[PDB]
């Protein structure tokens, strides 16, 4: 079996040119797709902004149209999902995680148009969901579609072009090449057995889709936060404590996200109308709140910079947090099309900032700046609910660009995964596949 | 399927023993690495001090430069030949093997031999890195506490071996992420599933980085400052640079391997023709670390200087050739010490040179040679050792120009792509393949 290894070693890192070239086309498409999707969601949130100006007098009438637009679009989104592709509701990352294990179908002819226009609906109405959901899945199907359309054969070409689509999907959603790649090879890939995912192909995919994203989204970062201060070595223990706090809260969040999936199922019982209606009702509540308290609504990217700069009061923070846990659950849990990845960054920021506030007053000898705790805490909910620290860290890092905060970021992150383990929480992406895969067996 | 649901619900669960044991491994590897770092420093400084004492008489100084380097080199090659041949050269492939259960981790031997062996080769100013020594030293440390604590299981044997190897790279570059990424991209059993707990590898690296920071805070290994940016119409240039690294990547692998052989003849396996040729190159090192220090040493010194575009074109080409020669002669000659470091320094110098050409050719792009320096810096590591994702994140963590992420990836990828289509192989694997096949044949 050593002789086998010698033969393998000498044959390492060889990816059929077909695969490579096909990853390239994959990335390019996912990029354009995500670009288009992003522009779509923007256009719609702008339309809705335009109607609130046409009715800018009459207060209740404005509160009406805010609700009704959000209603109408959310419904339209929930519909498309229920009526044409149930798999494309909720996130869509576990759906892809499954596909990689060969345990789920990649019904692209369905999902692509449903998840796309479906999300365009839910995100475009200002619901509390990210774009990673839609684009990761959309990304995977694009990878499937071009595997089909080109009839490429083999386990490699089916795992690889599915994974590179998935990555280009995260990369194009955050402008975060490395985060895309790291996500695949830390969370996405078949977690329990060896697989034939060519990493070099994953790359080319992501490269393309980042280039695509940069062509149309040049010269504006999603989160601008500026160069923050440093953290002295005697400051480190404080990030570990923050990590612990995230570590206990991590699974508690997972309970509610799952539990809420259930408690909302009853409200509609699986009924296409009780759903779409409940769908547009949460949706309406979103457009409403995206006016009377916009920090409680929307994707969350907008208040990240604001909180990091320490511009919110303590009151205002605790409010934003509570209001955002509620609205985050209500949208994701209710099986609307859209990731929980983005609003998890937003919650981790707000929570980390709050810790930093308290940290600042209690330790003036440290010369603290709340905003370093905001950035540490930013990817830490992602590290105790999704349990992909390495992805969270390198995502935050790629986005906030405070590499000097590498230690506090790791230490917070690690402390979060450690306490999220010792309090018996479960990789929220896994647990959703386990519920979905089990729900398929236990109805036989 | 049923099995998978059982697995999913049981994912990311690491026996607390393993975690706690990782923490201690990192801590030791950190301290070890620190101490090793200080050692090499100390000895380069001794030699600096003797050249002060004989600073008059020109050929007398050129001699003492030679003879200290000679004597230390010898002491290194000896300790290696006489007590642990496994700990000559890099020691990364040696650990890669151990991960595959195909090599032994004779720590009782390697620890003292690689340590003091390296202290000899590095401390005499040889063209070798610290990653070699620290990575291996790191794995054995992980082995040793697996032994000393009698931890049982495949997990505990692969995990504590890996976290040690990571902590080892991390503390060698102050690069936590590069440590972990290296494990799960290059070090791990490349062809079968394994039981390396990533959460455990983290904790290791955390500890060893904290260890490194405690003694080496407020000094970056490479300072380069915030470089300029790269416009989109400039990207193609990094792809061309990547292709150039892609062709030369394997060509370098040839000579590094070929030279391991052409130098074996000179000694035939004989502990005396070895140790003597050992201190002969070693002497030529300290000698050159005086009459042209850029051609000698670890190479970190000239990175900043090249990135700022302070070398002329002549001076660069020279430094390149000189450094290819000296790099081979030191690593190829099976002296204890990585080729990782000198590969960065080669990549910078090559990249810079490309950037110079680039600048004069395209004034409308407003280029700055130093952006090609930083692209190229991890590009040789992407075409010779073929671990681009570790290369990028390593350079990124060390040069901190996140804005150059695209050029860095594009160059890197273009290098792994052309080092595949010209039939080169992961230089760390090819060394294991040589070593495992020379075992059975």
């Amino acid at each position, epitope marked *: 079996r050593r002789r086998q290894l010698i033969r393998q070693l000498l044959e390492r890192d060889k990816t059929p040119l077909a695969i490579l070239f096909m990853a390239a086309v994959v990335g390019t498409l996912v990029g354009l797709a995500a670009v288009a999707f992003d522009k779509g969601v923007a256009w719609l949130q702008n339309q809705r902004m335009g109607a609130l100006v046409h009715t800018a007098d009459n207060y209740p009438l404005l509160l009406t149209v805010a609700f009704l637009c959000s209603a109408v679009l959310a419904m339209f989104g929930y519909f498309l999902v229920r009526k044409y592709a149930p798999e494309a509701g909720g996130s869509g990352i576990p759906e892809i995680e499954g596909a990689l294990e060969d345990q789920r179908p990649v019904r692209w002819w369905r999902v692509l148009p449903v998840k796309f226009f479906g999300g365009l609906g839910t995100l475009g109405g200002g619901m509390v969901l990210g774009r990673e959901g839609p684009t990761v899945q959309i990304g995977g199907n694009i990878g499937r579609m071009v595997l089909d359309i080109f009839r490429l054969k083999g386990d490699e070409a089916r795992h690889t072009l599915l994974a590179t689509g998935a990555a280009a999907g995260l990369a194009a959603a955050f402008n975060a090449p490395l985060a895309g790649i790291l996500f695949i090879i830390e969370e996405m890939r078949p977690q329990f057995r060896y697989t034939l995912i060519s990493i070099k192909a994953v790359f080319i995919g992501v490269i393309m889709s980042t280039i695509m994203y940069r062509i149309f989204n*040049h*010269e504006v970062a999603l989160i601008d936060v500026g160069k923050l201060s440093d953290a002295p070595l005697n400051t480190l223990w404080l990030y570990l404590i923050l990590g612990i706090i995230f570590g206990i809260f991590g699974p508690i969040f997972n309970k509610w996200v799952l539990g809420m999936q259930d408690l909302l199922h009853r409200v509609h019982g699986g009924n296409i109308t009780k759903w779409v209606l409940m769908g547009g009702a949460i949706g309406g509540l979103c457009g409403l709140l995206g006016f009377v308290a916009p920090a409680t609504s929307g994707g969350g990217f907008n208040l990240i910079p604001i909180a990091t700069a320490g511009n919110f009061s303590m009151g205002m923070l605790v409010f934003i947090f509570v209001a955002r846990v509620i609205t985050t659950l209500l949208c994701f849990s209710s099986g609307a099309p859209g990731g929980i990845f983005a609003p998890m960054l937003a919650l981790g920021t707000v929570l980390g900032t709050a810790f930093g506030m308290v940290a600042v007053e209690l330790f003036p000898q440290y010369h603290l700046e709340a905003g370093t705790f905001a950035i540490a805490g930013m990817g830490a909910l992602l590290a105790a609910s999704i349990r992909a620290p390495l992805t969270g860290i390198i995502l935050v890092l790629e986005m906030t660009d405070n590499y000097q905060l590498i230690l506090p970021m790791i230490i917070t992150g690690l402390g979060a995964t450690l306490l999220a383990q010792f309090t018996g929480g479960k990789p929220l992406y896994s647990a959703i596949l386990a519920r979905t895969l089990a729900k398929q067996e236990a109805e036989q | 399927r049923r099995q998978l649901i059982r697995q999913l619900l049981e994912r990311d669960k690491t026996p607390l023993a393993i975690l706690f044991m990782a923490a201690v491994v990192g801590t030791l590897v950190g301290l070890a690495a620190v101490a090793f770092d200080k050692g090499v420093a100390w000895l380069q400084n001794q030699r600096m001090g003797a050249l002060v004492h004989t600073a008059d008489n020109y050929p007398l100084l050129l001699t003492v430069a030679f003879l200290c380097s000679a004597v230390l080199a010898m002491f290194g090659y000896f300790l290696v030949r006489k007590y642990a041949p496994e700990a000559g050269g890099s020691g990364i492939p040696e650990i890669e093997g151990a991960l595959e259960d195909q090599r032994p981790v004779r720590w009782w031997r390697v620890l003292p031999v690689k340590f003091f062996g390296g202290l000899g080769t590095l401390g005499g100013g040889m063209v070798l890195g610290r990653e070699g020594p620290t990575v291996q030293i790191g794995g054995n440390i992980g082995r040793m506490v697996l032994d000393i604590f009698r931890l049982k299981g495949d997990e505990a044997r692969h995990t504590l071996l890996a976290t040690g190897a990571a902590a080892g790279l991390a503390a060698a570059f102050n690069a936590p992420l590069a440590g972990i990424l290296f494990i799960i991209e290059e070090m791990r059993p490349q062809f079968r599933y394994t039981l390396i707990s990533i959460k455990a590898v983290f904790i290791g690296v955390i500890m060893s980085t904290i260890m490194y920071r405690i003694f080496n805070h407020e000094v970056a290994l490479i300072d380069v400052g915030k470089l300029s940016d790269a416009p989109l*119409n*400039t990207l193609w240039l990094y792809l061309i640079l990547g292709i150039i690294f892609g062709i030369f990547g394997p060509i370098f692998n040839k000579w590094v391997l070929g030279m391991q052989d052409l130098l074996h003849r000179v000694h035939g396996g004989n502990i005396t023709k070895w140790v003597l040729m050992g201190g002969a190159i070693g002497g030529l090192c300290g000698l050159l670390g005086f009459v042209a220090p850029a051609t000698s040493g670890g190479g970190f010194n000239l990175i900043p200087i090249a990135t700022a*575009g302070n070398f002329s074109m002549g001076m660069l080409v020279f430094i390149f050739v000189a450094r290819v020669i000296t790099t081979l002669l030191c690593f190829s000659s099976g002296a204890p010490g990585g080729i990782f470091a000198p590969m960065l320094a080669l990549g910078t110098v090559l990249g810079t040179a490309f950037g110079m050409v680039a*600048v004069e050719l395209f*004034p*409308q792009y*407003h280029l*700055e040679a130093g952006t090609f320096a930083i692209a190229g810096m991890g590009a040789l590591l992407a075409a010779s050792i073929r671990a681009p994702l570790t290369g990028i994140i390593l350079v990124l963590e060390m040069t901190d120009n996140y804005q150059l992420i695209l050029p860095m990836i594009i160059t890197g990828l273009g290098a792994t792509l052309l080092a595949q289509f010209t039939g080169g192989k992961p230089l760390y694997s090819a060394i294991l393949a040589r070593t495992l096949a020379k075992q059975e044949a």
Partner: antibody
Amino acid sequence: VRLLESGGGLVQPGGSLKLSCAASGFDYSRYWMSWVRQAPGKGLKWIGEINPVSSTINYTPSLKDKFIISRDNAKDTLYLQISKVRSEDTALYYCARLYYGYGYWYFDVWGAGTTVTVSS
Amino acid sequence: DIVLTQSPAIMSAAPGDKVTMTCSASSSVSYIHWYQQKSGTSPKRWIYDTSKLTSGVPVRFSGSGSGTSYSLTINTMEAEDAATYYCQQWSSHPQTFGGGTKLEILR
């Protein structure tokens, strides 16, 4: 953001003057700067550009040190020095901050200009 | 160094009119920029990279072209558009400016 150039006015033919452009509202290093002049009634003429690290300075098809461009990142100030001033050099002089989109460079923000009159 | 020549040197339309001026260039140039210089004001970067609008430029303004001819168009020109407009390229060094097209208003 503002560029407020000065030191212009009256010079004797053949003689020489130094324009300062003083900038404030943006990290002045980070930015390639430039000078563009405009003769009364006529169009625009690029003079030169200096990067932040002063390690690249291109001028237009000029002469010897017909023009000399420099910058003091400490003072946030751009300088243009003209020699042997024949009357072609009677213009409004703009210091402009340089930038790009896809990567083809433009003149981002222009100062107000000082006037230089070559006359006896 | 590319010589850029601008269509009408002086043009004249009445508000409401769709208006076009032109930057024809001696060699091939790509991604040109346009500057608006109103009376006794400094140039203002107007349209950049052939067709992108600077922030705050009314959407009544547009850009197109490629190769040797480029244009700038105002769909329903407005009286506050009286300026001279220069085009400028920097696809080839050194960069170079147009002759200017002075738009004058009919009222």
